[PDB]
Amino acid sequence: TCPFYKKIPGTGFTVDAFQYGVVEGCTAYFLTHFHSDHYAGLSKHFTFPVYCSEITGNLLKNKLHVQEQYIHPLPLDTECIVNGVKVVLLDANHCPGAVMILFYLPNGTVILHTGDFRADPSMERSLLADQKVHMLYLDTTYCSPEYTFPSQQEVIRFAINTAFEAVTLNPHALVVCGTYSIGKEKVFLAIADVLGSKVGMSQEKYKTLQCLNIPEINSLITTDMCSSLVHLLPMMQINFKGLQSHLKKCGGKYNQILAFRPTGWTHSNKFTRIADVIPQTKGNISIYGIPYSEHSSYLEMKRFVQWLKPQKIIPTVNVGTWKSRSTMEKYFREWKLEAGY
Ligand code: NI
């Protein structure tokens, strides 16, 4: 049954709640972003209104075959009325098409649901700045001080410089990047751009990328692998066996693989600077784990909440254990006492 933290009080609305069958009293189902833990349950047989971004609605129609009459895309940064309630969708700085949702309840309460997000000071100057928020449904993925990671910009600089160096030294090296969902497209796009190549991929993955309104995409991606020296593969194939097998398939065009696994966090973050990251190597294959995150770090999350000053916080991640819940609640109290709200 639907958990409480997916229900918006005083409305007929739920958020990211498609795997519970028909939710009692739900008149509109919101979807923050097209990641499987959030869309789980949608298909061509869904007949209730779904409210989402334009990008998310492209992916629902083309990838899951949801019928067009039940998709309600909304523009960003625009006041809209849904079943008698004012809502705004804001950019979440997560994956393409990901939003945060502001609900203006009939009784004067204002609620922000962050979906999944990477907090940023740029958010302090959206339509959030203009009114008080009473309740915050917060992406608490990395809500503990051990979770530090670099800026996205520093990680992309590392990747571009590493790839460019390797292929200039050996023009017969192939670069491979892992993927299993939308998000983190800058990794493979930035590498292809520095090398003057398109990114090659499966037909399924090309289809997914064509849904995302990325400018000049026909210019950066392709299904012709033979013409590309940056290849995208499923994340599960980014290991020595799977990469040896792929190299076999390229027919002696290449004699070395440099592969990238964009992870969120890994404990090598608590000790090592991005400058200092090294690969795992076996023979002519090297694998780099790079800490490219599309969730808030602890410090980024703290700064956002201390700026927003909500009256109540409802965590949406790590809610299944008492030890996690208690940890989280202790940090929320610290933040409130330090800032004075
Ligand atoms: Ni997500």
Coarse DSSP helix, strand, coil percentages of the chain, rounded to the nearest 5 percent: 35, 20, 40
Instruction: Give the distance (Å) from ligand 1 centre to CA of residue 180.
Output: 12
Sign of CA dihedral 26, 31, 32, 38: positive
Closest CA to 44 of 14, 16, 70, 73: 70
Answer whether CATH 3.40.50.12650 is correct for domain 148-295. yes
Q: How far apart are CA 71 and CA 66, in angstroms?
A: 8
The one-letter code for the residue type at 34 is F
Cα dist from 341 to 121, 145, 310, 333, whole Å: 19, 21, 8, 10
C-beta separation of 117 from 97 below 8 A: no
Q: Where are the domains of the chain?
A: 1-147+296-341, 148-295
Q: What is the resolution of this structure in A?
A: 1.6
Cα dist from 163 to 44, 122, 155, 170, 226, whole Å: 41, 30, 12, 11, 19
**Determination technique for this entry:** X-ray
Instruction: Give the distance (Å) from ligand 1 centre to CA of residue 294.
Output: 8
Q: The domain 1-147+296-341: what is its CATH number?
A: 3.60.15.10
Tally Cβ neighbours within 10 Å of residue 261: 20
Instruction: Give the distance (Å) from ligand 1 centre to CA of residue 139.
Output: 10
Instruction: Give the distance (Å) from ligand 1 centre to CA of residue 144.
Output: 18
